[PDB]
Amino acid sequence: NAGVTQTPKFQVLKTGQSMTLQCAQDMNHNSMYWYRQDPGMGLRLIYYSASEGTTDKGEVPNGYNVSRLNKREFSLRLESAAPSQTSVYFCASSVWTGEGSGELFFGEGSRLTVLEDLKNVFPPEVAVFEPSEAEISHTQKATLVCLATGFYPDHVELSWWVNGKEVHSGVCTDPQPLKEQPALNDSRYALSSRLRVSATFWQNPRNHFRCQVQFYGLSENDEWTQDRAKPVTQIVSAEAWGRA
Amino acid sequence: IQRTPKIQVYSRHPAENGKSNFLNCYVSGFHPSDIEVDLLKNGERIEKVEHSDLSFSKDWSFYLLYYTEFTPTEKDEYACRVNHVTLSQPKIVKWDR
Amino acid sequence: GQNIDQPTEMTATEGAIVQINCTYQTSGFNGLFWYQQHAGEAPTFLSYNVLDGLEEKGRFSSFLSRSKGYSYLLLKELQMKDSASYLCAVKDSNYQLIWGAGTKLIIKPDIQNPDPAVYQLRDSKSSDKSVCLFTDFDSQTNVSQSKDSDVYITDKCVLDMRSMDFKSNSAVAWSNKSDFACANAFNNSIIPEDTFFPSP
Amino acid sequence: MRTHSLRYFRLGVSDPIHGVPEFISVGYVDSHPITTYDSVTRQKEPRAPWMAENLAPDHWERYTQLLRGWQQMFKVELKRLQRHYNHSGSHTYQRMIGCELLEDGSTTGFLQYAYDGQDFLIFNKDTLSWLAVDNVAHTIKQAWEANQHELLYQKNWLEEECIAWLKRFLEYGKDTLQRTEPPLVRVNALFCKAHGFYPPEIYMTWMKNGEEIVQEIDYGDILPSGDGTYQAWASIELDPQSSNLYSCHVEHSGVHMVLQV
Ligand SMILES: *Cc1cccc(C(=O)O)c1O
């Protein structure tokens, strides 16, 4: 009962590299679709599959292919990735197609970034900044800030962990990253998040706070030739303890 | 409920001996759709015989036109032979002029 | 068909009502869909119209006029969780979907007791950055981008302390320059006159 | 214009004889086939040259995909019907959808299904409901009526889309569809015979002494002659014990004809 499952969530590619996105649906649907979503325009269909055993081009098939492997699976292939294929890809399915009022069911999306060279790829630096004493005395609340900075591409997941458990209450993370150098096309990114708690919670010396950032970057097979460390997929974090 | 074919045999134009024409066999009203149709000349099967694609009626039955070019004479006898699941033996309808 | 149009962005206040418009010009019409898509998430089906009129579903209604080639999505009693993009899509004569570019809906929280202040956060021993938090301002306040290439300012973000049924706006500014002070971090913004700046 | 219609048919067969397609779909404008698809070709193709000449390859490519999908759906529905009827052997499933644009400008729309060539489900686009003829159909009725949007969708298709398609195809085929070939009529029991006419709609009858005698008249079928035109006849038996004036009356495309015998 998982609905539409597509992988991977994130992928960085070098121009010319090949890539397959997977999609499966467990809803016994007959129709499946691959879309790309880009800023400033509506979803564009790449290829679709009206039924098991047939597929056809959508609006933007060039650079792609598909395989309806079986009733459940519809894979999308980028044989030779190009920078223009930097996009967010969505798998979707419907019970039938061209049949009445049936809606689409979407996968979680796959963010692809295609680069001429991987020299631009950096993990974030992650730092945590403890609450202002002035805030604490003025409001009886305490805001921690986490900064994730210098990363590229924008393939990150930031979370807060309190006493070893992820939390969402009291958390606000920027919905979009800041370009550290707005006028550059390849600018590295920054992301801020806050976690606000009661002063009494902050003032318990055994409460533990961690900001964690999952970065999606290179894998073993990606070639690395720079002097700096290979920017592999990795978790970068920083922490703070409460203080009395 | 299976419906037996109505079978009608007729020339395209009013027949005149020695004048080229078309012999038609219109088979209609039948269900289900599988059916076999031959045109006969003097009791034997004509080989160059055309037919329209299976056609659909609003009452869910089917129809077909079978035809062949022919020059009628006074001696030659023509017919349509049809078999269908509703028919025990093939049904022959002769061309009546 | 050939095109579909909807506003790029709309901003309304918590508790209020908003109407998101969608117009379309198509070769034929087989239905109009609205989808919701939270930032970084999958679109999800919201509504379908195909004959003329208004249809209600909870706090959302959707309207269609086929002759005007027009639909709206009506959201009542706005909550913060309604912040999302809303996508309009029309099925044409050949049952192909044509997708609008989407409307980003931004919701201003209702800030009960505004207490605007700029605080300096504690330095981290692992970072050369100084960090300033502009917080607790009312939602009419807009946070401007930095005018200094070595100062970074993020936009306002609404956090919900649910346990206390308490929401608040904040923006973050940081820099590693000697120049940088919280007293001047947000100088390029129009901030409330009564903004609290505690002494350093 | 005269009355015109657009109709699309589907046929599914559950256990077909070797080589014979399990699925066939044909569209018509009036009596003219315009499109065809089946499970053997797996291609949707024009059946009239005025369809081929006005619809680009991308039209046929797209409807080829759709029909491949609709083929599969028809198989699934038939399988469910034959399961619930508890029937063995080969059975048939049929759909007909269509609309008419009447001479006076009014429209009709219809959608129905059949199992083994008998009415199964009939759509009412005004009350937005399905008429079920038995309890297998009744089960499907409940499922199909469960989402109102489905019903609304077909109403819209039938009343707007179908009529729009019909008007488009009428213009494409106007040299064929809107022409008139008047009948040649002769008398030859008295037989009145007409041939060479188009459209196929014709009304022939016999009157005796200026009065019509409907149930003493034998009405022949309107039949294709094979060259695009049609033929038909009507007969009546002679009373040899009384003198009577017999006349054949023929109406065709706004023209009346009388042949006095
Ligand atoms: C090709 C076509 C167009 C519209 C509708 C149908 C149908 O079968 O209902 C078909 O076949």
Tab-separated table of N, CA and C and ligand atoms in Angstrom, chain C residues 95, chain D residues 6-10 23-27 35-37 44 59-60 63-64 66-67 70 95-97 157 165 169, ligand 1:
chain	number	residue	atom	x	y	z
C	95	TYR	N	-7.776	14.140	-24.598
C	95	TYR	CA	-7.650	13.649	-23.214
C	95	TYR	C	-6.240	13.817	-22.678
D	6	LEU	N	-22.642	10.767	-35.062
D	6	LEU	CA	-21.346	10.195	-34.814
D	6	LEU	C	-21.525	9.090	-33.786
D	7	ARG	N	-21.057	7.881	-34.095
D	7	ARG	CA	-21.183	6.728	-33.186
D	7	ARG	C	-19.863	5.970	-33.125
D	8	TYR	N	-19.423	5.580	-31.926
D	8	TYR	CA	-18.283	4.671	-31.813
D	8	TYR	C	-18.693	3.379	-31.121
D	9	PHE	N	-18.317	2.253	-31.722
D	9	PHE	CA	-18.644	0.930	-31.205
D	9	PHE	C	-17.403	0.192	-30.710
D	10	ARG	N	-17.579	-0.596	-29.657
D	10	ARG	CA	-16.580	-1.568	-29.256
D	10	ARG	C	-17.202	-2.958	-29.179
D	23	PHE	N	-10.875	-8.006	-29.667
D	23	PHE	CA	-11.366	-6.642	-29.499
D	23	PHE	C	-11.370	-5.907	-30.836
D	24	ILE	N	-12.504	-5.280	-31.143
D	24	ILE	CA	-12.682	-4.484	-32.348
D	24	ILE	C	-13.418	-3.191	-32.005
D	25	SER	N	-12.941	-2.069	-32.529
D	25	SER	CA	-13.642	-0.801	-32.366
D	25	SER	C	-13.775	-0.042	-33.676
D	26	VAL	N	-15.002	0.376	-34.010
D	26	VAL	CA	-15.240	1.106	-35.243
D	26	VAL	C	-16.098	2.352	-34.977
D	27	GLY	N	-15.718	3.481	-35.568
D	27	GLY	CA	-16.530	4.687	-35.508
D	27	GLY	C	-17.258	4.943	-36.847
D	35	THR	N	-13.333	5.211	-38.702
D	35	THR	CA	-12.121	4.760	-38.000
D	35	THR	C	-12.237	3.303	-37.616
D	36	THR	N	-11.095	2.641	-37.443
D	36	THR	CA	-11.121	1.260	-37.007
D	36	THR	C	-9.866	0.963	-36.184
D	37	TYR	N	-10.018	0.055	-35.222
D	37	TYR	CA	-8.927	-0.445	-34.391
D	37	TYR	C	-9.276	-1.890	-34.049
D	44	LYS	N	-4.920	2.208	-34.651
D	44	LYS	CA	-6.133	2.917	-35.032
D	44	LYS	C	-5.898	3.558	-36.395
D	59	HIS	N	-2.528	12.342	-34.691
D	59	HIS	CA	-3.877	11.980	-34.281
D	59	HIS	C	-3.987	10.468	-34.163
D	60	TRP	N	-3.621	9.751	-35.228
D	60	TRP	CA	-3.700	8.287	-35.231
D	60	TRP	C	-2.748	7.651	-34.206
D	63	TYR	N	-4.506	8.119	-30.708
D	63	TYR	CA	-5.686	7.276	-30.515
D	63	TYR	C	-5.315	5.807	-30.572
D	64	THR	N	-4.210	5.494	-31.245
D	64	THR	CA	-3.687	4.130	-31.171
D	64	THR	C	-3.337	3.788	-29.694
D	66	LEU	N	-4.521	5.219	-26.962
D	66	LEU	CA	-5.751	5.209	-26.168
D	66	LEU	C	-6.509	3.888	-26.335
D	67	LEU	N	-6.640	3.434	-27.586
D	67	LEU	CA	-7.397	2.217	-27.881
D	67	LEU	C	-6.699	0.976	-27.332
D	70	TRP	N	-7.885	1.085	-23.951
D	70	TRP	CA	-9.302	0.797	-23.845
D	70	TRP	C	-9.581	-0.672	-24.134
D	95	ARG	N	-20.064	-1.882	-26.519
D	95	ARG	CA	-20.308	-0.518	-26.104
D	95	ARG	C	-20.699	0.285	-27.330
D	96	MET	N	-21.627	1.215	-27.159
D	96	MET	CA	-21.923	2.168	-28.213
D	96	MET	C	-22.071	3.541	-27.582
D	97	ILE	N	-21.349	4.513	-28.124
D	97	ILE	CA	-21.462	5.886	-27.656
D	97	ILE	C	-21.640	6.756	-28.871
D	157	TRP	N	-19.103	14.937	-22.285
D	157	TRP	CA	-18.562	14.402	-23.538
D	157	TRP	C	-19.669	14.287	-24.584
D	165	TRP	N	-16.960	17.009	-32.311
D	165	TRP	CA	-16.263	16.076	-33.205
D	165	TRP	C	-17.091	15.862	-34.480
D	169	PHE	N	-15.981	16.477	-38.362
D	169	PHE	CA	-15.935	15.399	-39.326
D	169	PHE	C	-16.911	15.659	-40.492
E	1	LIG	C1	-11.089	6.357	-31.815
E	1	LIG	C2	-12.238	6.635	-30.946
E	1	LIG	C3	-12.515	7.959	-30.590
E	1	LIG	C4	-13.450	8.249	-29.617
E	1	LIG	C5	-14.139	7.231	-28.982
E	1	LIG	C6	-13.896	5.898	-29.317
E	1	LIG	C7	-14.614	4.810	-28.607
E	1	LIG	O1	-14.324	3.609	-28.989
E	1	LIG	O2	-15.428	5.057	-27.731
E	1	LIG	C8	-12.953	5.596	-30.326
E	1	LIG	O3	-12.779	4.309	-30.698
